[PDB]
Amino acid sequence: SGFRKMAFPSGKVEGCMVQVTCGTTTLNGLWLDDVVYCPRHVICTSEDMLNPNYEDLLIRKSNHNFLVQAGNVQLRVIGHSMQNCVLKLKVDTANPKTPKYKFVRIQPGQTFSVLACYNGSPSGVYQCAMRPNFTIKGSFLNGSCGSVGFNIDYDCVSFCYMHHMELPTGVHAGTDLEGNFYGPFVDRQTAQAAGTDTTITVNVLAWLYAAVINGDRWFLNRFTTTLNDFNLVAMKYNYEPLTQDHVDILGPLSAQTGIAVLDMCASLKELLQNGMNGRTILGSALLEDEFTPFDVVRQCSGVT
Amino acid sequence: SGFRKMAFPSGKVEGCMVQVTCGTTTLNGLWLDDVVYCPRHVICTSEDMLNPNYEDLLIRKSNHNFLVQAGNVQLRVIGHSMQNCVLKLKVDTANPKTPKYKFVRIQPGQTFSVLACYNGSPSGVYQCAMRPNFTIKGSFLNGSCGSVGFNIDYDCVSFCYMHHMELPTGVHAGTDLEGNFYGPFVDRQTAQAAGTDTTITVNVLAWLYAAVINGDRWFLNRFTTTLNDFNLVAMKYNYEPLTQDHVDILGPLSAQTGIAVLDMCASLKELLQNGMNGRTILGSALLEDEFTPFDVVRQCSGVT
Ligand SMILES: COc1cccc(Oc2cc(Cl)cc(NC(=O)Cc3cncc4ccccc34)c2)n1
Ligand SMILES: COc1cccc(Oc2cc(Cl)cc(NC(=O)Cc3cncc4ccccc34)c2)n1
């Protein structure tokens, strides 16, 4: 029993982290096979970042300008290319610690672990969700760029995120491993609206099921609701509309607890309308949306 | 910016996890050098656990009865001994992945990362605190015994906790790596009181400083207090008394923000007496006590 914001074991990703330096800028890279992936803004100086022409800035750089270091050993760069907002530095040595991996584009509302790095060295690991507005509420300082987000399925690491920047609002933006930003963001120091965020309804319901499984049940009531009635409440409280696909994804948790999804929606409706009244759920005084239904089953079943 | 419940990168610990089986019981072990450490209750059957005589139960076991497996390879056991509540299985092979390590006994109120394991395989990593009452509020299922808690300082892993059991209250108990339980607990299936827990005052103040650094400042007020006046409030709200040693440990955060420790205590006093009024701090609607002053500085400075 117990329910924690659990990250994946980071070992397989730690073995891929390297330091990339170009000119006076140092950030993290991801060494997989004979390629090092890193944010393309490594080639910018502070003046460049206001309105960079990346194609022009990259043309002034040669293979020998990209200093790549894995621990204490230097990697020899034999190629460089830009794909969207990432640079791919071909090196003459395949990473011996390359795990089985995939590059995936996660959907908003999905979760992943972040291995925060500085100077190619891992500092910490935490679990977070890709917000509905495509930002992440991470914990990153200057030098953390190139730190990655990932999920692990047995022995396969699915890389889904590479850190690029912090918006003036304090939230974070980045790309998939093909360099495509999540959200409307550009790698430029200019005004950027993140847009309205919403609470991830299916994750809140999953976490309410996690609460029931772990013994916190005070919020269960004698009521039920319909998808339409629930969605009127979700609208008022800036929650994502719940669809039948979400109800279906909650199937396993509904079967495990014997609490119909619409009955759990009625519990959520009452908590949204009445608040917690000073009570807590799984150690939280607010409704948690960073656990997907998959995360709840995985944590409550101990998948390794 | 941003503030997360960040765990240490778990790689160095993942390389030490092995599976230990004795009879019909399987749990995790920690392989460091040529010794595998695991909870001694691995030698118990379900009947034994109500009132086990560990000395007698261990006498019926020989080296060949302890099956130790590291991934797919079997380790050869050449010795066994019980030290307090842990078994030390001497193996004929030193763990090639043994990191630089120490065995430490943490103080209540200190934090550490837990690498939850099942069948010697890592499932997840999370950060938690040793409660003032010497329990941990973890996330553990059956089979998780032998999973360890640790802290990392550059390249040295300080192991502080080994998981042994879950109390009927849903909280967790375990030992240091010399097999000494934290708290009054015994490795027996009998009624066990954890005793009154308290909120870790110095950690709450550290987290309030983390909030100020990251931009959440609404709770700062025009007031100050004294250690004595603050401790009257801490008493009423089941918070640990704040000492001058705690004020001294908060020195760096006080200097970083320019907010005197007693002024921060006055902010905490007002939040304790008035609540949050429906507002949040660092994404939390309650006062967080799982970050030590050291954790706040480390996360806010990006130490690797
Ligand atoms: C003015 O609005 C914006 C909006 C989006 C971006 C912006 O500037 C940019 C543009 C580019 Cl190309 C890269 C960056 N790099 C970073 O933000 C680096 C970084 C990452 N994480 C945490 C950090 C904490 C503190 C300091 C820096 C951090 C910024 N300005
Ligand atoms: C009846 O009171 C108690 C108090 C303390 C212990 C007790 O029983 C004991 C005594 C011993 Cl020696 C070992 C154990 N082992 C465990 O608790 C194993 C375990 C660990 N973590 C999470 C778990 C979740 C679900 C099931 C088992 C879990 C229990 N009973």
Curated annotation (Swiss-Prot), chains A, B:
Catalytically driven reaction(s): TSAVLQ-|-SGFRK-NH2 and SGVTFQ-|-GKFKK the two peptides corresponding to the two self-cleavage sites of the SARS 3C-like proteinase are the two most reactive peptide substrates. The enzyme exhibits a strong preference for substrates containing Gln at P1 position and Leu at P2 position
Phylogenetic placement of the source organism: Viruses, Riboviria, Orthornavirae, Pisuviricota, Pisoniviricetes
Assembly notes: 3CL-PRO exists as monomer and homodimer. Only the homodimer shows catalytic activity. Interacts with host FBXO22; this interaction promotes the proteasomal degradation of nsp5.
Subcellular location: Host cytoplasm; Host Golgi apparatus; Host nucleus
Species: Severe acute respiratory syndrome coronavirus 2
Role noted for this protein: Cleaves the C-terminus of replicase polyprotein at 11 sites. Recognizes substrates containing the core sequence [ILMVF]-Q-|-[SGACN]. Cleaves and inactivates human TRMT1, preventing tRNA guanine(26)-dimethylation of tRNAs. May cleave human NLRP1 in lung epithelial cells, thereby activating the NLRP1 inflammasome pathway. May cleave human GSDMD, triggering alternative GSDME-mediated epithelial cell death upon activation of the NLRP1 inflammasome, which may enhance the release interleukins 1B, 6, 16 and 18. Also able to bind an ADP-ribose-1''-phosphate (ADRP).
Active site as annotated: H41 (for 3cl-pro activity), C145 (nucleophile)
Name this protein carries in UniProt: 3C-like proteinase nsp5
Cross-linked residues, Glycyl lysine isopeptide (Lys-Gly) (interchain with G-Cter in ubiquitin): K5, K90
Domain Peptidase C30, first and last residues per copy: 1-304
